[PDB]
Symmetry: D2
Subunit: 116 residues, 4 copies
């Protein structure tokens, strides 16, 4: 139901071991921790939640791009990359958040699909 994929545009490789922290916005307007993990050898992060755990709300996906670059000896521009979105419609959809990284640029896309 929720997948994150991260790619490295400088090395032409998946971005491996990247820390990802997901939050859900709570009634008090604060961000509550929801799920977290590290990207795999293929730059993917799977099994963050279940269909029933992943309910309607505003989510924040935070990707620790600064530590990723610093660990390669590169000094990047951004503190991190954040993605905030309504999984308004979330349980009956699958969400893939993709991010492509460079030291001074990033881009992000969402692929949202229905299991019919």
């Amino acid at each position: 139901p929720l997948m994150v994929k991260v790619l490295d545009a400088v090395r032409g490789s998946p971005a491996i071991n990247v820390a990802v922290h997901v939050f859900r916005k709570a009634a008090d307007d604060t961000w509550e921790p929801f799920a977290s993990g590290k990207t795999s050898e293929s730059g993917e992060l799977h099994g963050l939640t279940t269909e029933e755990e992943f309910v309607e709300g505003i989510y924040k996906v935070e990707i620790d791009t600064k530590s990723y670059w610093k660990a390669l000896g590169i000094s990047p521009f951004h503190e991190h990359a954040e993605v905030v979105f309504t999984a308004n419609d979330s349980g009956p959809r699958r969400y893939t958040i993709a991010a492509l990284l460079s030291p001074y640029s990033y881009s992000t896309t969402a692929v949202v699909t229905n299991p019919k």
Copy 2:
């Protein structure tokens, strides 16, 4: 010293009248308002601050992409686009933050130049 440029990848045009809110991170770890404005006819936002007002710190540039799309009758994916970065940490630089928008995707880049060259 701080310029924002926004482009619309669907219409192939500058993204006009887009709300931009800048914050500075305060000692207490909360975001304090710093400057705000709307993109011009060319998708640019100038004169947000001065060299002297624009001090060392962590800034957040928040672009109200959701309203932009909604006003064109499109239901977008993201609540906004945010750019967080450390500025002026090795002396005064001019920053341009560029953003390219689509309903389900965005990309952002920084061009940092030294006024001493």
Copy 3:
């Protein structure tokens, strides 16, 4: 060994049924057809070639973006999206060419891995 993935940045979906034509540059500096296909329900195109068919050379991956947009009633800017690169020059690699599409913009990335 060679995969193409295409995404639609407007609808937030894989770009389905997109025509992809691959060429290899021949000695006479003309583009010789090499493989071709349509993107699947997942926006992917697999099994285009084999490790031994896919030899050292300069390849061109051509994505028919114009027809994709026109079929959705949108009049796009580019005739197509082309990706030209040298492959297998330093021994066999697996290549994924990804493309993200909008009417007036596209971006492309390569993921190259060693088995």
Copy 4:
């Protein structure tokens, strides 16, 4: 009428001194040279053509990304970045082709404007 802007996503800078070659497609389906230049200190290339010279047709803008990276000691993926498009098909327009570069990735976008406003 035709402007090219190139940015370096690794250094957060304009991409300077980048070779750009523009072609027009001829009746025999071959690419005829049309204009060429190097990006300036701001990553821009101006004055490639005139309104009168810049006629209806299919153009190719070719950016020599491989030599750019190689001159910075980096071994890139692409031979170049090409943009192919139909211009002035419904009368005169002003075209800006923008490109953002990384060793293994690039993105390109067009801003097309009408001087008739």
